[PDB]
Amino acid sequence: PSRKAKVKATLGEFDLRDYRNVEVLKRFLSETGKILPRRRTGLSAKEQRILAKTIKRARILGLLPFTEKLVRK
Amino acid sequence: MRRYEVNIVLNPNLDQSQLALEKEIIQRALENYGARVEKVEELGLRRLAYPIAKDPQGYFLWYQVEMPEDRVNDLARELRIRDNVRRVMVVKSQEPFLANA
Amino acid sequence: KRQVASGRAYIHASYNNTIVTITDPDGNPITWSSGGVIGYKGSRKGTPYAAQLAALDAAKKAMAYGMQSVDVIVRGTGAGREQAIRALQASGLQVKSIVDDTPVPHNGCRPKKKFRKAS
Amino acid sequence: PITKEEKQKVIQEFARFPGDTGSTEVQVALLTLRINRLSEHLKVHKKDHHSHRGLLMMVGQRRRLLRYLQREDPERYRALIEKLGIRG
RNA sequence: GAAAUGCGCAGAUACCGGGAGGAACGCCGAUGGCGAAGGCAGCCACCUGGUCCACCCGUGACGCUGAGGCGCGAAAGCGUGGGGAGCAAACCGGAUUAGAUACCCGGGUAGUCCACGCCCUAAACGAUGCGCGCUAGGUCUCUGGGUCUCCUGGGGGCCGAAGCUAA
Ligand SMILES: [Mg+2]
Ligand SMILES: [Mg+2]
Ligand SMILES: [Mg+2]
Ligand SMILES: [Mg+2]
Ligand SMILES: [Mg+2]
Ligand SMILES: [Mg+2]
Ligand SMILES: [Mg+2]
Ligand SMILES: [Mg+2]
Ligand SMILES: [Mg+2]
Ligand SMILES: [Mg+2]
Ligand SMILES: [Mg+2]
């Protein structure tokens, strides 16, 4: 079970090495700033590896956050 | 000669005259280091996900260059020497890798 | 009586004590309170009753300066971290948000031995 | 590094005949290309001990093909060395 | 556990802003990967080793193993510089206890970090030397190739044929 929204589906034909595409990348960050698990991006093992490096370049450029803050508690 | 990509974040707060001066020093810095400049795109300024240099924005640049490998670290060194150059990121270029396509 | 109306409440929750600071919309404190402030002494301070009393004291203390609404900022994983929030809500302060901002290194400083053990 | 056409100028420099990609002469040459590069590298990076193992194997490989070529046509052997500048 | 040393009106704890510095890299991240081992984890560039697949192009047994030799070798430790955030042998205190040279608590030097040079050890563990050939399968997986359901490689797991084992 446990199969809600898998992020690969809810997106189109995107490039994974593109570190400037904030609006596509930020879909793989959590509500906090965290890189999401595979069981939640629904990527392949090799796919996740690349997104993982791409997201980090995006953070260095200030386009994606390193961390954020939970708004309910 | 390898093909790179030079990212430069810029002081979002300077005007036409201090910008046009920076871009000058940037393309002269390139010239002196072997940078043959293929395609470029001044995407401008966007909202940073986190304040850099206490600004909440940053003016962006991007060059795709062929240049001597042995000279890249100095090129990036020289580029960071400036004060409105907040970040330099020099990646070597890659064939894109589609997904979900 | 410097008049502020709205501002931030910081809950600093810990295992040994809870401690609540109230600030203006810029973060400069207006007033504060804690388990020791409400006359507890030892281990009683980290109890969730202490966090109730402490939170309520720092609210009453703040409604004098005329507070009405508050953004809450939890920070810590103590006992009565949450009994502190419940008190803030039932208190005559608008709780407009609760945000957890507990600080956490990106693996940074070698912890005390108490705090690392089985890795 | 060493580029394709860099390499090429060595295979054609040593082939016993056109299209000879893999004769003892060609191999013992190609290695000496890699060995001198590595040793040049390790004169700077004296602490790259991992790469150094590479060198120990290239060398072990060279003097093994050399040891064969000398047992087969001691002509071509004393010939390869004078051309490459080894054993001395 | 409860506490007390300890810090605080020379204004601490909690909170916002600015700065310095040392060390380590959260998520990704594991059932994953690399490496001969020891070991290897933010990001970028440069220098450099190993490896795998397809083509079936070249050489023509050039192979395997390897006493000595040589190099590598976690942590602690040594020398000379440097550095020193946090941590912490020794040590100084507070507790606990019948005692408590200890577990708990407040401090703290070497050390941990860097460079160079030594040391050469270990539950240096798969407690399983290296290479090659042969002997059912099922299944999860990392990484190639193909006519891509499936086929065929290379690696990491699990269960099991034959067989082996004192178990
Ligand atoms: Mg053939
Ligand atoms: Mg023949
Ligand atoms: Mg050692
Ligand atoms: Mg050591
Ligand atoms: Mg020392
Ligand atoms: Mg300490
Ligand atoms: Mg201690
Ligand atoms: Mg297999
Ligand atoms: Mg397999
Ligand atoms: Mg049986
Ligand atoms: Mg039995």
Side-chain angles (χ1 to χ4, degrees), chain D residues 24-72:
Chain D
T24 313
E25 282 91 346
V26 177
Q27 311 188 55
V28 164
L30 251 52
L31 293 209
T32 321
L33 192 272
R34 304 191 52 206
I35 289 181
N36 300 23
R37 296 290 152 119
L38 245 199
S39 309
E40 199 63 357
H41 167 75
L42 302 197
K43 205 147 70 200
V44 164
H45 298 305
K46 322 174 210 193
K47 271 193 314 163
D48 185 357
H49 302 305
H50 279 67
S51 287
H52 178 83
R53 187 164 168 268
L55 184 85
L56 258 57
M57 305 198 301
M58 332 215 297
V59 186
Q61 188 53 19
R62 197 162 65 181
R63 31 179 295 259
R64 187 133 56 207
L65 302 212
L66 286 161
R67 206 200 304 268
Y68 168 71
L69 202 293
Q70 192 233 335
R71 190 214 313 151
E72 287 311 301

Side-chain angles (χ1 to χ4, degrees), chain A residues 73, chain C residues 56 72 82 84-95 98:
Chain A
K73 285 301 307 312
Chain C
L56 287 172
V72 173
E82 231 76 59
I85 300 177
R86 305 149 149 73
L88 260 294
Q89 287 153 312
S91 84
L93 286 165
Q94 272 281 63
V95 173
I98 302 154

Side-chain angles (χ1 to χ4, degrees), chain A residues 8 11-17 19-20 22-23 46-47 50 57 59-66, chain B residues 5 7 9 41 43 46-50 52 60 62 87 89 91-92 94-101:
Chain A
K8 183 185 169 79
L11 270 85
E13 298 74 352
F14 51 83
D15 178 12
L16 279 171
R17 308 193 183 280
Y19 52 88
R20 297 190 290 158
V22 190
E23 56 271 68
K46 161 142 124 180
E47 280 179 350
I50 306 177
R57 323 178 121 189
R59 297 161 153 179
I60 288 204
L61 291 192
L63 306 166
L64 284 177
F66 289 101
Chain B
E5 296 172 31
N7 298 280
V9 199
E41 37 182 315
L43 202 293
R46 311 174 84 175
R47 334 261 169 122
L48 302 176
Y50 60 89
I52 301 183
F60 276 114
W62 182 98
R87 287 254 210 283
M89 175 146 271
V91 178
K92 95 152 51 63
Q94 282 153 85
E95 308 270 39
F97 181 106
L98 293 214
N100 201 60

